[PDB]
Structures are given as C-alpha cells and as structure tokens.
C-alpha cells in the first residue's frame, strides 16, 4: 500500500463532499422538523382558542342555571 | 514542522472519521426529536377528540337548560 | 495543476474547519428545536390541566340541571 500524494488528493475530495452531502441531508430533515412544528405551535393556539371558546360558553350556562335554581324558588 | 504526506493520511483519517462520528450524533438526536414530535401530534390530536366530547356535551346541557326554563314558565 | 502537499495541507485544514462550523451551525438549530419541543409539551400539559378543570364544572352543571330538572317535577 504505498499510498500516494494524488490518491489522498482524492480521497480529500470524495471525503469531503461525501461529509457535506450528509451534513445537506441533516440540515433538510432539520427545515421539516422546524416546519412541524410551527404547524404544532399553532395547533396549540388553536386548541388555546377553542377552550377560551368554551369557558365563555360555560360561564353562560353557570348564570342560565343560576336563573333558574333562583326563580323556581 | 516538516508535516509529511503519512502524517497528513493519518489527519485526514482522524479528520474525517470525527466529523462522522459528530455528524452520527446529529443524526440520532434528530431522529429522538423526530420521534418526540410525533408524540406530540399524537397528544394534540386526543386533546382535540377531547374536546370534541366537550363540544357535544356542552350542545346537550343548553338543550336541556332550554327545556327547563320554557317549561317553568 | 501540479497540486502539492502544503497546498492540500491547507485544503484539510480549511475543509475540516467549514464542516465542523457547519455542523456546529446544525446542532445550534437542534439545540433550540430542543427547547422548542420542551416549552410545546408544556403547552400540551397545561392544555390538558384546563380540559380537567373543564371536565369537573361540567360534571356539577349536571347535577344541577338534574336537581332542577326532578324538583320541578
């Protein structure tokens, strides 16, 4: 094996893209993920949303019984 | 320093195989985050079904809220 | 091109260089994906937390409705 000067140039090259082009692949994944989860966070305001929705809902029907428990005394 | 070609092979070696095994840790960090947010689509998705179960209760007591304060008149 | 070794010398050393900083660019981003993912899980507890909380009014705004329904008969 007397591994030469232009072999290593070689072996320089192909490393590197080959380390570069995984390094693309991590960085692609990463994008997705980053994406997910702004879809996730405003998932969650959402779902905020409709329970605010239903606490105003449910502070109605806590007076309509109220109302009610009242007059039919 | 009369930094010879054996010596740059055994850098280029260590060089490389570090930023594998750096870019390996990456990879399985990324793939846990992967995996945490797919849990957490999971949850999201029961805190909607949830709520859903709400939502119909919610029609069910104005229904009968409804019939109550009409008949009491 | 009669490309030597002190200038693929330098090519190592540079190119290891911008792979490591790319790579430290990467996990920097999964770093804070991290945090992301811990404050959305959060997100997730305390959605759960208010969703029990609306879980028992509702069960004492049946037994209301229900008090009232039975004593106005």
Same mark, same amino acid.
């Given at each position: 094996?007397?591994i030469?000067?232009?072999?290593?140039?070689?072996?320089?090259?192909?490393?590197?893209?080959?380390? %570069? !082009? *995984? =390094? &693309?692949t #991590? %960085? !692609? *994944? =990463? &994008?997705? #993920? %980053?994406?997910?989860?702004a879809?996730? %966070?405003?998932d969650?305001?959402?779902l905020?949303?409709?329970i605010?929705?239903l606490?105003?809902?449910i502070?109605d029907?806590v007076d309509?019984?109220?109302?009610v428990?009242?007059?039919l005394?």
């Amino acid at each position: 094996k007397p591994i030469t000067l232009e072999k290593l140039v070689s072996m320089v090259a192909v490393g590197f893209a080959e380390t %570069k !082009a *995984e =390094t &693309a692949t #991590i %960085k !692609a *994944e =990463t &994008a997705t #993920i %980053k994406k997910d989860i702004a879809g996730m %966070k405003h998932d969650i305001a959402q779902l905020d949303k409709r329970i605010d929705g239903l606490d105003k809902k449910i502070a109605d029907l806590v007076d309509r019984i109220g109302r009610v428990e009242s007059k039919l005394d």
